[PDB]
Amino acid sequence: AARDLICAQKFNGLTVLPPLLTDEMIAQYTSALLAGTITSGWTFGAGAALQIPFAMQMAYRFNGIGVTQNVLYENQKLIANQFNSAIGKIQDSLSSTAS
Amino acid sequence: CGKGYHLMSFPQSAPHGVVFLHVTYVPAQEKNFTTAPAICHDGKAHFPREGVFVSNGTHWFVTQRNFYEPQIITTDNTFVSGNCDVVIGIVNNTVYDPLQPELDS
Ligand SMILES: *[C@@H]1O[C@H](CO)[C@@H](O)[C@H](O)[C@H]1NC(C)=O
Numbered sequence: 601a602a603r604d605l606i607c608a609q610k611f612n613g614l615t616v617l618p619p620l621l622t623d624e625m626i627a628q629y630t631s632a633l634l635a636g637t638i639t640s641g642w643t644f645g646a647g648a649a650l651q652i653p654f655a656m657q658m659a660y661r662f663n664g665i666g667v668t669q670n671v672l673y674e675n676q677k678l679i680a681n682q683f684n685s686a687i688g689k690i691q692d693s694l695s696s697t698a699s
Numbered sequence: 700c701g702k703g704y705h706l707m708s709f710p711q712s713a714p715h716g717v718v719f720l721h722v723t724y725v726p727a728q729e730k731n732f733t734t735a736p737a738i739c740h741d742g743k744a745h746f747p748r749e750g751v752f753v754s755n756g757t758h759w760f761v762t763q764r765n766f767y768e769p770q771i772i773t774t775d776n777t778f779v780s781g782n783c784d785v786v787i788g789i790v791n792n793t794v795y796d797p798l799q800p801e802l803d804s
C-alpha cells in the first residue's frame with residue numbers, strides 16, 4: 601500500500617548487481633591483517649611471518665622513530681594504560697558522534 | 700616496488716608504456732630461538748645496540764635482525780641503562796669485557 605522507490609526503480613530496468621566480496625570474507629581479511637600485524641611485526645609483508653613478542657616489536661618501532669628502546673621497558677605499563685584509554689576514547693567517539 | 704625489501708630497479712622500454720624489473724630481497728630459511736629483552740649483570744641492565752638477544756638453549760648470543768650470525772655478548776655492542784628490577788623477562792648471564800684480558804697480561 602506504500603510503494604517505495606526501490607520497486608519503482610526496479611520496474612524500469614535499473615538493477616543493482618551484488619558485489620563479489622561480501623562482508624564475511626572482508627572481515628576475514630581484516631582479521632588476518634590484524635593477526636599478522638600483532639604476531640609478526642612487519643616481516644610478513646616482505647617474506648614469511650616470523651614470531652616476535654609484542655614488547656620487543658614496540659621496542660623496534662621506538663628505535664625506528666628515534667627513541668632508544670630503554671625508554672619503553674621502564675615505562676611499559678604507562679604505554680599499555682595510555683593505549684587502552686585511547687581505544688576506549690575512540691570507541692566513545694564513534695558511539696556518540698555520527699558525523 | 701616489488702614484494703620484499705627493495706634493492707634496485709631496471710626500466711625497459713615497451714609499446715605505449717614502461718616495464719620495470721624490481722630486484723628484491725626475500726628471506727628463505729627460518730629457525731626457532733628463545734629470546735629475552737635484556738641481560739642482567741652486576742645489578743645493571745644491558746641492551747642490544749643494533750641487534751637482538753637470542754639463545755640456543757645453552758649460550759646467549761647477539762645477532763643482527765635479518766641474518767643469523769652469532770656474536771659474544773660484550774660491552775662494545777651493548778649500552779647500559781637502569782637496573783634489573785624494572786624490565787620484565789630479563790635473564791641472568793655474564794657480560795664479557797675485552798679490557799680485562801688486556802689488563803691481565
Ligand atoms: C617453531 O616451533 C613451533 C612450535 O611447535 C613449530 O610449529 C615450528 O614449526 C617451529 N619452527 C619454525 C621455523 O617456526
Ligand SMILES: *[C@@H]1O[C@H](CO)[C@@H](O)[C@H](O)[C@H]1NC(C)=O
Pocket residue numbers: 739789790791
Ligand atoms: C638472577 O640472580 C639474582 C641473584 O644474583 C636472583 O635473585 C634472580 O632471581 C636471578 N634471576 C632469575 C631469572 O632467576
